[PDB]
Structure 1
Amino acid sequence: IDNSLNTNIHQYHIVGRAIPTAKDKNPNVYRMCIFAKNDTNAKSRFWYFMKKINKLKKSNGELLACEQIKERFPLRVKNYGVLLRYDSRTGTHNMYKEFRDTTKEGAIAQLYSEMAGRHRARASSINIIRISEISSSLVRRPHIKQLLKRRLRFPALHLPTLQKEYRKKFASKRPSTYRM
């Protein structure tokens, strides 16, 4: 495992419930899937949505469950459509975006990077609704569509990224970006 490569987003399944009062003997319990850096942040987000959607605050609630969801096949690439709600500098907008990778958390990390890069949307301005795996026949974004051809191949035009050890300061002849 390469920590230079891993991101720190995980999916958590959190179940909570208002404390039973004398008014209602047993409140309905709520469950949610939240992507967060750790279970503590996931629970904070869960209570934020509990309070925002229902009229239920952490001080009047209790946590029935909180466990990390692990992807079944972390080495099988799949296409994800993620619905999204975020507020820009002048309004709120819901959009829909598509990624493809091996884990839902990885797709969400891609989503965060891309929303920051394209719209300057900080993570505090993003609400993730409805990330779900989609079928190839229902993929809608062209940048994902072109990734699903019968045989997919292309050259390797990236510049070489050597190790620090061989990233030597003085070269004896000009290297080639063509390499290949």
Structure 2
Amino acid sequence: MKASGTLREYKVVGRCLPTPKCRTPPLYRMRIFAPNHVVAKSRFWYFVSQLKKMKKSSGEIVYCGQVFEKSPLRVKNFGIWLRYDSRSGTHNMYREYRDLTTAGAVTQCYRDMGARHRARAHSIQIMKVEEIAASKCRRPAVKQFHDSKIKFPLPHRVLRRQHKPRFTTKRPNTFF
């Protein structure tokens, strides 16, 4: 699990091999977040082998599909439940974000945990991504965007293209 690129979401279902002892095994659905579907089906076995006694040698993937966003043009407040590991013991977390797709939020969560806690991607176990309303929010860094009349300027502007006219004559204005 290398959290490369924008993550996607996959609904992968599997089951044990059919045996004369048990006619048809039950089906197990998951929600995996992976860059490509190949490392999705691998990350699938990692979870099911610790919630069940099943391994890839005694299972079969039944459906490796990608699920798209129901409303990619709506802004949403996503609630993520984590299981990351530090250098000393593992912890449960509840991190909140604000994005357009759940995969857009999960990616954002992976960059943030790496940024705020120096945890690499192989240490984190996303367990629940729930769409919650603006009243059930808890983290203050996202509640501040709940305003029908939000209004804010752009402060002192970090001038880009600072190398295209590399040797100018005028002092570059930063107040737009």
TM-score scaled by length of structure 2: 0.93
Aligned residue for 2:102?
A: 104
Q: For 1:174, give the aligned amino acid.
A: R
1:23-75, Cα deviation, whole Å (9 max, x unpaired): 22221110001010010011001011111211000010001111101102212
- What secondary structure sits across from 1:124 in the alignment? helix
Aligned residue for 1:177?
A: 174
Aligned residue for 1:82?
A: 80
- Structure 1 alignment gaps of length 5 or more: 1-6
Aligned residue for 1:37?
A: 35
Aligned residue for 1:50?
A: 48
- What secondary structure sits across from 2:61 in the alignment? strand
Q: Distance between the aligned counterparts of 2:164 and 2:144, measured in 1?
A: 35
Q: CA deviation at 1:169?
A: 1.1
Q: Distance between the aligned counterparts of 1:98 and 1:171, measured in 2?
A: 44
Q: Distance between the aligned counterparts of 1:17 and 1:112, measured in 2?
A: 29
Structure 1 residue ranges (4+ consecutive) displaced by more than 2 angstroms after TM superposition: none
Aligned residue for 2:159?
A: 160
> How many residues align structurally?
172
RMSD, aligned α-carbons: 1.5
- What secondary structure sits across from 1:168 in the alignment? coil
Tell whether the 8 Å contact from 2:13 to 2:64 is kept in structure 1 after alignment.
yes
Q: CA deviation at 1:8?
A: 2.7
Tell whether the 8 Å contact from 2:137 to 2:143 is kept in structure 1 after alignment.
yes
Tell whether the 8 Å contact from 2:6 to 2:104 is kept in structure 1 after alignment.
no
Higher strand share: 1
Q: Distance between the aligned counterparts of 1:41 and 1:75, measured in 2?
A: 28
Q: For 1:110, give the aligned amino acid.
A: Q
Q: For 1:161, give the aligned amino acid.
A: R
Q: For 2:151, give the aligned amino acid.
A: R
